[PDB]
Design a protein around this ligand. Structure first.
Ligand SMILES: Nc1ncnc2c1ncn2[C@@H]1O[C@H](C[C@@H](N)CC[C@H](N)C(=O)O)[C@@H](O)[C@H]1O
Length: 243
């Protein structure tokens, strides 16, 4: 496991979390590198840590730095993949174990209540999720319900011990107005898969060899030679409504 040792990254994450509202849930709290600074935001906090011995040590540390028994942070010894997320508004934050990143992201994207997620993960994953240099199939598949932001790059030297690759700080925000109804999620995500894996050179050829009016692409501001990665969230949703 790679614990966050760079205090500047801690300050940066706390700065982003401080601009949000409501209760906070932290994934992989560890020794409390983020938990202790997050508790000073005076908001309700739940810190999740799968190592029970480490979770008990963290519960003592959070209580010691808290105003006292009468006033704070609940430390839960649990696997976040099995943790029931509340359906009420909350904010999620975490330094994710790099081998469980996509499973944790899947669990969060299908989960309720949370309005913002502030997550530390592998740099290549955070880059693809934030659509740096164009969107990937997974980003476009979640775009009607969420927005992704790349806050910063984080060197492997900012962790102890050092991971094999660098990291990225990713923000995710739940759209208050979804672009596609959640009931149509599986058909929407199937269409996005079909376009990213379809044969053809460019959108005009891809949409031809697929099970769309020929005037549709240019009327929606899409160049016929464009690649699926160049489409915006609004264009994917218009394509879903069309098909
Ligand atoms: N599935 C899980 N659910 C909740 N915690 C996890 C899970 N898997 C790993 N853990 C913990 O996730 C943490 C991930 C670490 N990269 C960071 C820990 C901590 N925030 C620190 O920076 O001090 C480790 O403390 C792991 O023990």
């Amino acid at each position: 496991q790679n614990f966050l040792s760079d205090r500047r990254v801690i300050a940066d994450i706390v700065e982003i979390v401080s601009r949000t509202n409501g209760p906070i849930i932290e994934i992989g709290a560890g020794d409390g590198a983020l938990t202790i600074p997050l508790q000073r935001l005076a908001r309700p906090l739940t810190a999740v840590e799968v190592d029970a011995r480490r979770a008990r040590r963290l519960a003592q540390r959070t209580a010691r730095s808290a105003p006292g028994p009468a006033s704070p942070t609940e430390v839960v010894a649990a696997d976040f993949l099995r943790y029931p997320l509340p359906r009420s508004p909350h904010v999620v934050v975490g330094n994710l174990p790099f081998h469980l990143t996509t499973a944790i992201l899947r669990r969060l994207l299908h989960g309720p209540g949370w309005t913002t997620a502030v997550l530390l993960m592998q740099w290549e994953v955070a880059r693809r999720r934030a659509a740096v240099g164009g969107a990937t199939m997974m980003t476009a598949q979640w775009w009607p319900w969420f927005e992704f932001g790349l806050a910063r790059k984080v060197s492997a030297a900012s962790f102890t011990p050092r991971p094999a690759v660098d990291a990225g700080l990713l923000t995710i925000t739940r759209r208050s107005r979804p672009l596609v109804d959640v009931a149509d999620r599986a058909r929407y995500q199937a269409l996005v898969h079909r376009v990213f894996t379809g044969r053809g050179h460019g959108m005009a050829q891809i949409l031809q060899r697929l099970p769309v009016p020929r005037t549709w692409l240019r009327a929606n501001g899409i160049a016929p030679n464009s690649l699926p990665r160049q489409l915006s969230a609004a264009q994917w949703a218009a394509l879903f409504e069309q098909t």
